Amino acid sequence: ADGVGSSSGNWHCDSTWLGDRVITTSTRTWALPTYNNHLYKQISNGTSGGATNDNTYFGYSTPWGYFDFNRFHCHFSPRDWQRLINNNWGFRPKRLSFKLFNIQVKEVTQNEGTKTIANNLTSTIQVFTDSEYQLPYVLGSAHQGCLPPFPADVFMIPQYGYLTLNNGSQAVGRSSFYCLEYFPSQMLRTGNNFQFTYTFEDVPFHSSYAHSQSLDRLMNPLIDQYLYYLSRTQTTGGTANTQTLGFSQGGPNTMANQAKNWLPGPCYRQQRVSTTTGQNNNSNFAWTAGTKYHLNGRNSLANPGIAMATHKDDEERFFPSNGILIFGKQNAARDNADYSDVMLTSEEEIKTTNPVATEEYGIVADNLQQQNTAPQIGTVNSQGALPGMVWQNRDVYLQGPIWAKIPHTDGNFHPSPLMGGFGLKHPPPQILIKNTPVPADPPTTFNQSKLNSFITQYSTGQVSVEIEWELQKENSKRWNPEIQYTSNYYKSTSVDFAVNTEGVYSEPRPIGTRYLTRNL
Amino acid sequence: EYFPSQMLRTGNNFQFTYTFEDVPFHSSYAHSQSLDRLMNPLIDQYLYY
């Protein structure tokens, strides 16, 4: 049975590689504190305080907390991530299991200056999953508070909150309030455990590979085309130079002129920034020159935006202003961190199919030329979908997110999340957890006011998550060797992806998925 | 007049049936959230700008 003196689960951290499948399992130790002193609170921000209109909000913070494993380093060790990206053309999630076990509730009393902590054996926690998607879904915004990448670390559970419609700092009639105690929930004492299972819906494999061809090079280099293009509008001669028409076939020496079947993907142009700072304009342009969208009178940066190549050849010092993912190095500051404290990703691989984020999409015609008027052209800085476009998605990273919830709407176009990962109409459900309030002694004459005098408590336990992943094997006939992700050979003060002398785990660099190649 | 047609005198009647093809439900509702507000208001992101 389950009692005070027996454990309700075991520690599972493992990975198993079987054929076309890999199964990861992770266990961590968590600590859960009481939030808001058991209260729900209205929160808002408005111009009155001095915020700009672009930052206003209205919402609620709750006493509850939630579990989040939406980063890949929750499930994969760095060596496992190497096995995946060097050997496979793609992967996708299939199913998951979740367990919550070995739960301990503790009470802390304050007397004079000294603080003491004891067990409370009869207290509970409450847990439920939102399986019908009835709550605002705050997973998928890339918040802090996921399970830690390193299995020995103990993490704090984050507080749940949400936003609803606002006008300035005020609410409107359509604004919704939610009470989370209004769902069914399971209550657990120190001997109880909790578990559920979930199945992923069909989703396309993430493409982990780069193309070894480019979209404008798909032709046979040895042969002419049978089609023709207009090669000459004027006679080339001694003196006159009158109007003429002349035509040529496309061939090996004019590839720019040949007829083609396909177009590069869409473009929304970003401003370019150099990591060599003396090359940048001297001014503070991050917001005023930023790439933005405009919704209901608010301006919001398109960050990272649609997938575009970070730079062209030999340009690596440049990046789009708001167009890339940027991670932190360990102990990086929250505000105004220096360039040496952060890690910049590069989407450079998709340069074959996708326009570079800092250039125009192309050129079109402005006017109607004639004998009287010379022709004029114009530059295309944003281009939506054209028939014949092909494109790649943004890459995924070991530090980065896995899935997002597709918003429930009448229409969408190519619902792949812009921060990267798998779009899901029915994502893995969110998991809510709370300490049950325990009153301090009531008065001995009746009073109708709600009791707000409590014994301070927190809880701890273990959590397990297990995901099964499907693999897509690499089939290539390429003769020469591939690029692989590898560790450095040379000696160093510390080992990458390990602890230091102080005990702190760190991740030296971001690692994407695209190493193997494939024909376009 | 180049199609087949049914002719009716004062005692006759006419009828037919039809089945709609699968179509998505019209959405009769407004959203209570906005697209730029979907985040958790209490927590920082781990990304940088």
Please tell me what resolution, in angstroms, this structure has.
2.3
Q: Which residues contact residue B42 at a Cβ distance below 8 angstroms, ignoring those fewer than 6 apart?
A: A61, A158, A159, A160, A161
Torsion angle, CA of A445/A446/A452/A453, rounded to 10 degrees?
Answer: 30
For A130-133, the CB contacts below 8 A with 24+ separation are A130/A183, A130/A429, A130/A430, A130/A432, A131/A429, A133/A426, A133/A429
Which residues partner with A364 through β-bridges?
Answer: A378
SS3 A429: coil
Residues of chain B contacting A, Cβ within 8 Å: 24, 27, 30, 32-49
Chain B residue whose CA is closest to A172: B32
Q: CA A25 to CA A99: how far, in whole Å?
A: 11
Q: Are A187 and A125 in contact (CB under 8 A)?
A: yes
Amino acid, single-letter form, for residue A451? L
Q: Which of A342, A354, A356, A357 is nearest to A271 (CA)?
A: A357
SS3 B44: coil
HSE (CB half, 13 Å, CA atoms) of A98?
17
Q: CA A21 to CA A452: how far, in whole Å?
A: 52
SS3 A467: strand
Q: CA B29 to CA A335: how far, in whole Å?
A: 40
Which residue ranges of A are tagged as binding site for AMP? 416, 423
Q: Which of B34, B36, B46 sits opposite A144 (nearest CB)?
A: B46
Would you say how long chain B is, in residues? 49
- E-assigned strands of A200-241? 206-207, 210-211, 228-234
Q: Are A507 and A388 in contact (CB under 8 A)?
A: no
Angle, alpha carbons A267-A210-A315 (nearest 5°):
60
The token pair that represents A239 in the structure block: 């003196």
Torsion angle, CA of A215/A218/A223/A227, rounded to 10 degrees?
Answer: -50
Chain A residue whose CA is closest to B34: A165
Q: DSSP labels for A37-93?
A: GG--EEEEE-GGGT--GGG-EEEEEEEEEEE---BGGGT--HHHHHHHHHHEEEEEE
Q: DSSP labels for A347-383?
A: -GGGGGTS-BTTS--EEEE-S---SSS---EEEESEE
Q: Are A114 and A210 in contact (CB under 8 A)?
A: no
Q: CA A177 to CA B17: how far, in whole Å?
A: 46
Judged by CB atoms closer than 8 Å, whether chains meet at B41 and A163 is answered as yes
The token pair that represents A186 in the structure block: 């399971």
Angstroms from A409 CA to nearest CA on chain B: 8
Helix ranges (DSSP H) in A181-311: none
Angstroms from A296 CA to nearest CA on chain B: 9
Q: Which residues contact residue A151 at a Cβ distance below 8 angstroms, ignoring those fewer than 6 apart?
A: A13, A26, A27, A28
Element (H, E) at A246: strand A243-249
SS3 A277: helix
The radius of gyration computed from the CA coordinates of chain A, to the nearest angstrom, equals 29
3-state helix, strand, coil in chain A (%, to 5): 10, 35, 55
Q: CA A359 to CA A440: how far, in whole Å?
A: 65
Q: Are A58 and A384 in contact (CB under 8 A)?
A: no
Angstroms from B19 CA to nearest CA on chain A: 23
Query: A462: phi > 0 → left, psi -120 to 50 → alpha, else beta; which?
Result: beta
Q: Which residues contact residue A24 at a Cβ distance below 8 angstroms, ignoring those fewer than 6 apart?
A: A14, A15, A75, A76, A80, A466, A467, A469
The token pair that represents A64 in the structure block: 């509850």
